[PDB]
Amino acid sequence: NTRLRIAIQKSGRLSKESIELLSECGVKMHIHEQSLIAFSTNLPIDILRVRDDDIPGLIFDGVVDLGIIGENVLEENELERQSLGENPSYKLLKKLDFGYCRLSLALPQENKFQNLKDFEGLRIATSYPQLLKRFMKENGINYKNCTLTGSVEVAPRANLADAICDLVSSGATLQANNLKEVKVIYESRACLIQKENALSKEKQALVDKIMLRVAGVMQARE
Amino acid sequence: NTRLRIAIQKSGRLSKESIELLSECGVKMHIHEQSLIAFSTNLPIDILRVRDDDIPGLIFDGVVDLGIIGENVLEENELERQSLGENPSYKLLKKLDFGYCRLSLALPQENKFQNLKDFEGLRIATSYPQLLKRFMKENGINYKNCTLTGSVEVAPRANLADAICDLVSSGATLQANNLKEVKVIYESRACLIQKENALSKEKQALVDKIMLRVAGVMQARE
Ligand SMILES: N=c1c2ncn([C@@H]3O[C@H](COP(=O)(O)OP(=O)(O)OP(=O)(O)O)[C@@H](O)[C@H]3O)c2ncn1[C@@H]1O[C@H](COP(=O)(O)O)[C@@H](O)[C@H]1O
Ligand SMILES: N=c1c2ncn([C@@H]3O[C@H](COP(=O)(O)OP(=O)(O)OP(=O)(O)O)[C@@H](O)[C@H]3O)c2ncn1[C@@H]1O[C@H](COP(=O)(O)O)[C@@H](O)[C@H]1O
Ligand SMILES: [Cl-]
Ligand SMILES: [Zn+2]
Ligand SMILES: [Zn+2]
Ligand SMILES: [Zn+2]
Ligand SMILES: [Zn+2]
Ligand SMILES: [Zn+2]
């Protein structure tokens, strides 16, 4: 394949802004809402619409050339792959101006929080077990893991966990579930990444051209 | 606290038959749209409705007491945890009479298939990278991985892969995508599992009672 492959989230919080960024950089495209493959109508570019969780691996494995992903999901999967004894690698091209959030430890509102030591021995529900594990190890706090892919915020009220480690932007979900944010462990935004192995001279020149436009678009949006 | 925790799939192929099995074993509960927890109204049992992928880890980590899960997902996650250097453990209580399927290697219809050696050097898309990795290592065949959580059958058409490793029941999806099943690598059905650490006397007696009914229900179904 001589067409550049770019992976983006098929459906979720990054989808609309990923597509808009590309169009604003002059990548015109044809999208069918329920389909894996979309393509560019004016440039030699294929757009792969996938579950966001898959994007880091597709870049690490060299299946696609570029990807737009939240830093949180990138780092979680990098840590996973390293812990499996692999050597995931990627180039960070740009931190983007959307997808802001923070991965934070949160406790029930009525809870005594003085200190990080207050998490000692607690069951902590999260979709980010590697990120959580690393933070807690680095701070010398022992805990019990509960991995849930969704509905993390309901785990305490369901008595499955004492606390959560979950993504927060506005804080409305925490408040709706009578939880309070006590400690940020990771700050995230969407980023543009590239696979490790060198592209052809033609594909790299196309990436270079796109990157100049990304920069110009972000400057014009301030 | 004191209520037995049973994890089942929130929404997918195992949900209906998991719920039916429990009710037929005399666990009464209402399943409406609870985000995570449903309470038995006649027994001290909580039903946790979760993504099926999370069930093995919830059992390994001791977050819940029982779980109903496909052998394929159990084994995939067991292998992942072992590759991280952990020692995941569980008790198998019963192989159940639903969720039958096979994980198979499949190629485009117009493809020359003589041998397993025909997969040498091919890019293979799958949602079960650990199961695939183990099979291919056992048979001494080198390959390139592509992990996709969904739309696996579309990967060859999207030029992301040369072949797939995916779940098959009726075979209609393979046929719809002009693929043919060439080699079964794993046979699966739903199973009932229990966490490793001993339950309280009360909880174990309740599990024992449920198990007698599971046996009786399956006998009465053929
Ligand atoms: N607030 C966010 C949020 N903000 C930014 N992002 C980023 O958007 C990415 C994609 O999020 P998605 O929910 O679409 O992805 P997914 O839920 O994992 O779904 P799939 O593609 O796997 O099907 C995340 O990995 C983050 O990088 C967020 N992702 C999830 N949330 C959740 O959105 C809800 C609202 O947040 P508040 O404003 O604080 O109440 C809460 O449940 C938050 O946990
Ligand atoms: N046919 C099956 C199938 N049969 C049995 N099972 C079992 O059912 C489990 C749950 O499957 P789901 O699709 O509901 O799981 P999921 O989408 O991963 O669910 P969540 O993560 O959302 O909880 C699988 O892990 C298997 O153990 C199957 N799982 C998936 N399929 C797929 O169903 C489609 C139709 O299959 P054919 O009849 O052969 O055309 C194809 O895409 C198949 O890959
Ligand atoms: Cl079309
Ligand atoms: Zn179209
Ligand atoms: Zn269509
Ligand atoms: Zn996701
Ligand atoms: Zn009801
Ligand atoms: Zn699943």
UniProtKB/Swiss-Prot annotation, chains A, B:
Q: Name the coenzymes or cofactors required.
A: Mg(2+)
The protein's annotated catalytic reaction(s) are:
1-(5-phospho-beta-D-ribosyl)-ATP + diphosphate = 5-phospho-alpha-D-ribose 1-diphosphate + ATP
Keywords attached to this Swiss-Prot or TrEMBL record, sorted alphabetically, are: Amino-acid biosynthesis, ATP-binding, Cytoplasm, Glycosyltransferase, Histidine biosynthesis, Magnesium, Metal-binding, Nucleotide-binding, Transferase
* An annotated Gene Ontology molecular function: ATP phosphoribosyltransferase activity
User: What is the activity regulation entry?
Assistant: Feedback inhibited by histidine.
Does the record's keyword annotation contain Amino-acid biosynthesis? yes
Location relative to the cell:
Cytoplasm
Entry's Gene Ontology cellular component terms: cytoplasm
Any GO BP? L-histidine biosynthetic process
Q: What class of enzyme is it?
A: transferase
This protein's pathway reads: Amino-acid biosynthesis; L-histidine biosynthesis; L-histidine from 5-phospho-alpha-D-ribose 1-diphosphate: step 1/9
Enzyme Commission number(s) of this protein: 2.4.2.17
Q: Which family does it belong to?
A: Belongs to the ATP phosphoribosyltransferase family. Long subfamily.
- Tell me, what does this protein do in biology? Catalyzes the condensation of ATP and 5-phosphoribose 1-diphosphate to form N'-(5'-phosphoribosyl)-ATP (PR-ATP). Has a crucial role in the pathway because the rate of histidine biosynthesis seems to be controlled primarily by regulation of HisG enzymatic activity.
User: What name has this protein been given in UniProt?
Assistant: ATP phosphoribosyltransferase
Q: Which residues of the full protein are shown?
A: 4 to 225 of 299
